[PDB]
Scaffold this motif. Structure first.
Motif, mmCIF file in Angstrom:
data_model
loop_
_atom_site.group_PDB
_atom_site.id
_atom_site.type_symbol
_atom_site.label_atom_id
_atom_site.label_comp_id
_atom_site.label_asym_id
_atom_site.label_seq_id
_atom_site.Cartn_x
_atom_site.Cartn_y
_atom_site.Cartn_z
ATOM 1 N N UNK B 54 4.831 34.388 48.867
ATOM 2 C CA UNK B 54 4.373 33.709 50.018
ATOM 3 C C UNK B 54 4.487 34.563 51.253
ATOM 4 N N UNK B 55 5.603 35.174 51.474
ATOM 5 C CA UNK B 55 5.883 36.028 52.562
ATOM 6 C C UNK B 55 5.014 37.261 52.546
ATOM 7 N N UNK B 56 4.794 37.833 51.408
ATOM 8 C CA UNK B 56 3.978 38.954 51.138
ATOM 9 C C UNK B 56 2.544 38.722 51.538
ATOM 10 N N UNK B 57 1.902 37.773 50.946
ATOM 11 C CA UNK B 57 0.565 37.384 51.159
ATOM 12 C C UNK B 57 0.302 36.950 52.574
ATOM 13 N N UNK B 58 1.272 36.477 53.280
ATOM 14 C CA UNK B 58 1.222 36.124 54.645
ATOM 15 C C UNK B 58 0.732 37.254 55.510
ATOM 16 N N UNK B 59 0.974 38.468 55.142
ATOM 17 C CA UNK B 59 0.553 39.656 55.778
ATOM 18 C C UNK B 59 -0.944 39.728 55.904
ATOM 19 N N UNK B 60 -1.663 39.187 54.979
ATOM 20 C CA UNK B 60 -3.062 39.080 54.843
ATOM 21 C C UNK B 60 -3.683 37.929 55.588
ATOM 22 N N UNK B 61 -2.933 37.076 56.208
ATOM 23 C CA UNK B 61 -3.377 35.860 56.781
ATOM 24 C C UNK B 61 -3.928 34.914 55.746
ATOM 25 N N UNK B 62 -3.275 34.709 54.653
ATOM 26 C CA UNK B 62 -3.529 33.815 53.588
ATOM 27 C C UNK B 62 -2.288 33.106 53.126
ATOM 28 N N UNK B 63 -2.302 31.845 52.866
ATOM 29 C CA UNK B 63 -1.290 31.010 52.352
ATOM 30 C C UNK B 63 -1.321 30.965 50.850
ATOM 31 N N UNK B 64 -0.296 31.305 50.153
ATOM 32 C CA UNK B 64 -0.014 31.038 48.797
ATOM 33 C C UNK B 64 0.498 29.631 48.653
ATOM 34 N N UNK B 65 -0.267 28.702 48.117
ATOM 35 C CA UNK B 65 0.067 27.285 48.104
ATOM 36 C C UNK B 65 0.318 26.777 46.714
ATOM 37 N N UNK B 66 1.207 25.803 46.650
ATOM 38 C CA UNK B 66 1.716 25.062 45.560
ATOM 39 C C UNK B 66 1.384 23.597 45.634
ATOM 40 N N UNK B 67 0.445 23.121 44.839
ATOM 41 C CA UNK B 67 0.084 21.717 44.839
ATOM 42 C C UNK B 67 1.194 20.904 44.171
ATOM 43 N N UNK B 68 1.317 19.607 44.464
ATOM 44 C CA UNK B 68 2.307 18.762 43.825
ATOM 45 C C UNK B 68 2.248 18.717 42.328
ATOM 46 N N UNK B 69 1.079 18.904 41.755
ATOM 47 C CA UNK B 69 0.895 18.908 40.323
ATOM 48 C C UNK B 69 1.486 20.158 39.666
ATOM 49 N N UNK B 70 1.987 21.108 40.452
ATOM 50 C CA UNK B 70 2.644 22.304 39.954
ATOM 51 C C UNK B 70 1.753 23.526 39.845
ATOM 52 N N UNK B 71 0.532 23.507 40.377
ATOM 53 C CA UNK B 71 -0.368 24.651 40.287
ATOM 54 C C UNK B 71 -0.476 25.388 41.612
ATOM 55 N N UNK B 72 -0.458 26.715 41.556
ATOM 56 C CA UNK B 72 -0.566 27.663 42.597
ATOM 57 C C UNK B 72 -1.984 28.062 42.891
ATOM 58 N N UNK B 73 -2.282 28.432 44.124
ATOM 59 C CA UNK B 73 -3.572 28.965 44.523
ATOM 60 C C UNK B 73 -3.463 29.520 45.931
ATOM 61 N N UNK B 74 -4.473 30.245 46.351
ATOM 62 C CA UNK B 74 -4.671 30.933 47.570
ATOM 63 C C UNK B 74 -5.572 30.182 48.512
ATOM 64 N N UNK B 75 -5.172 29.976 49.762
ATOM 65 C CA UNK B 75 -6.006 29.343 50.781
ATOM 66 C C UNK B 75 -6.083 30.291 51.970
ATOM 67 N N UNK B 76 -7.233 30.904 52.261
ATOM 68 C CA UNK B 76 -7.342 31.821 53.381
ATOM 69 C C UNK B 76 -7.364 31.120 54.732
ATOM 70 N N UNK B 77 -6.850 31.760 55.786
ATOM 71 C CA UNK B 77 -6.929 31.226 57.154
ATOM 72 C C UNK B 77 -8.249 31.636 57.809
ATOM 73 N N UNK B 78 -8.516 31.194 59.031
ATOM 74 C CA UNK B 78 -9.739 31.580 59.741
ATOM 75 C C UNK B 78 -9.787 33.084 60.029
#
Lengths: 72, 79, 50, 50
Positions: B54-78
């Motif tokens: 999460x901290x790593x990817x933050x460098x890119x202006x992207x959120x590494x996200x964790x849905x409640x169902x337990x699955x990970x994915x990438x959400x880019x910022x503007x």
């Protein structure tokens, strides 16, 4: 006027809509005001018109129509 | 002291990036793949170093996200 | 599976408990001040009438 | 004695008037919160009688 000053007091002491407060709208069942709420309502009615009411005659008042009837 | 990993990077983050699973995962993640519970290897890996990633990817202006169902994915910022 | 769910639960519970502790306390403070002044007013009323 | 007691009565009367005004003012403000907490947030969660 008195008949609308009563509404001014009732709506802002119970928080209910002006449309809800009709002449026959009872406080407890229609407006939902419970024991302490009705006590505060009667106190506010006393304060608005700077008068005083007996305990029994006041507790007899349990409706907008009765409220105005004792007020007017 | 000088010439010491901690000067530039947290040990756990370097440990994660040095893992053999990282390049695969990185590649995939960037491509938009979602990660669920069935692909154990990947999922487990993700779980182990979540905050570092999460901290790593933050460098890119992207959120590494964790849905409640337990699955990970990438959400880019503007940005 | 466990590792997932346990986490989720921890966060849920902590937020709930702390938020209710934070809000309900002051809500009851206000209710109690209003109760107290009403009680004083009623005692004064009854004593005055009598 | 009754005239002397009517002076205490008048002190109590003035005190009672002051308390009356304060109580009504409190209720006026509290009404907004009541209309705002109709979300079913008040029945048990917020109104912890304990």
């Amino acid at each position: 006027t008195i008949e609308e000053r009563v509404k001014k007091i009732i709506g802002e002491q119970l928080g209910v809509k002006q449309e809800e407060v009709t002449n026959n709208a009872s406080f407890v069942e229609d407006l939902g005001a419970d024991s302490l709420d009705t006590v505060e309502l009667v106190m506010a009615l006393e304060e608005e018109f700077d008068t005083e009411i007996p305990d029994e005659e006041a507790e007899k008042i349990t409706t907008v129509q009765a409220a105005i009837d004792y007020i007017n | 002291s000088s010439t010491h990993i901690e000067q530039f990077m947290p040990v756990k983050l370097a440990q994660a990036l040095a893992n053999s699973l990282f390049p695969e995962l990185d590649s995939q993640l960037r491509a938009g793949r979602h990660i669920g519970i069935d692909d154990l290897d990947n999922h487990a890996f993700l779980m182990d170093f979540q905050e570092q990633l999460e901290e790593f990817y933050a460098r890119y202006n992207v959120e590494l996200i964790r849905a409640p169902e337990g699955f990970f994915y990438l959400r880019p910022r503007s940005t | 599976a466990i590792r997932v769910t346990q986490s989720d639960r921890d966060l849920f519970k902590h937020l709930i408990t702390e938020a209710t502790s934070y809000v309900s306390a002051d809500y009851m403070r206000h209710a109690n001040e209003r109760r107290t002044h009403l009680d004083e007013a009623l005692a004064l009323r009854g004593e005055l009438f009598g | 004695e009754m005239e002397n007691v009517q002076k205490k009565l008048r002190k109590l009367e003035r005190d009672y008037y002051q308390i009356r005004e304060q109580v009504v003012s409190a209720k006026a403000g509290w009404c907004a919160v009541m209309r705002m907490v109709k979300d079913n947030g008040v029945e048990r969660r917020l109104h912890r009688r304990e």
